[PDB]
């Protein structure tokens, strides 16, 4: 059907500003104790995750530049090595994806 009467600003305020409709204050924010950026407990530090995705993208660009075209999933493991890092004794027989910047401190 249709309304029988306009609804006043008072009723509309008792509806719109009722607590159930308010935005709740979040009790689960904190500071990355080492890195020092904001984060929720159960979620990754956004800044750290972005700085990881950047390096993943650069590595993957090198991988694409080396594999040539599509349909070339290798049949061996892969290892990524930064400048001035000779292939360790454990990484022989694994594809090497050379990169041209110093290894990040967070890359172990």
């Amino acid at each position: 059907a249709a309304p029988k009467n306009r609804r006043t600003i008072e009723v509309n305020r008792c509806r719109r500003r009722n607590p159930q409709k308010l935005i709740k204050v979040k009790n689960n924010i904190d500071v990355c104790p080492e890195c020092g950026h904001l984060k929720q407990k159960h979620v990754l530090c956004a800044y750290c995750y972005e700085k990881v995705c950047k390096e993943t993208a650069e590595i993957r660009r090198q991988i694409g530049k080396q594999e040539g075209g599509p349909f070339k999933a290798p049949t061996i493991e892969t290892v990524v090595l930064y400048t001035g890092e000779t292939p360790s004794e454990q990484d022989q027989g694994k594809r090497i994806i050379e990169r041209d910047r110093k290894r990040p401190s967070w890359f172990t």
Binding site: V43, L44, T78, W106
Partner: protein, 152 residues
């Protein structure tokens, strides 16, 4: 009523559900780490685990080969499954994938999730460590370790 139904409903029906999960799983086997909506990744985690289980049986088995043929779409990955992934987990008997939640998607504010196969070459996800063992509460609990061990 939906008591005891473990399978999400997604896509345009059951078949599209299998096909969506198949594309997610193929992306995972190809890149070893993918960011996807949280619920879809949680649905695909079981399939990725059982795919590694089937891949351990090895090429020679035919049932496993048919299964990996269905569940991998670019077939270059089937070698990998049977020669890089399944060999990699010859020790672990379970839990080959780690799944995290990440900042919600910018456009549609969906609940996201990064899922990866343990042990890959990629830069490591920023996992959350526990509190250092030297914190006050941990030190008191360490004192209790000692004092209880001596008594017993």
């Amino acid at each position: 009523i939906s008591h005891g139904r473990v399978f999400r409903r997604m896509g345009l029906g059951p078949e599209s559900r299998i096909h969506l999960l198949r594309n997610l799983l193929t992306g995972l086997v190809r890149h070893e780490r993918i960011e996807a909506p949280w619920a879809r990744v949680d649905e695909m985690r079981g399939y990725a685990e059982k795919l590694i289980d089937y891949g351990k049986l090895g090429d020679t088995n035919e049932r496993a080969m048919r299964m990996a043929d269905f569940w991998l779409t670019e077939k270059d990955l089937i070698p990998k499954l049977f020669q890089v992934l399944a060999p990699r987990y010859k020790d672990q008997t379970g839990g080959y994938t780690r799944m995290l939640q990440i900042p919600n998607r910018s456009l549609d504010r969906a609940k996201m999730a990064v899922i990866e196969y343990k042990g890959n070459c990629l830069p490591p996800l920023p996992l959350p460590r526990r509190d250092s063992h030297l914190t006050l509460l941990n030190q008191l609990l360490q004192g209790l370790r000692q004092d209880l061990r001596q008594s017993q």
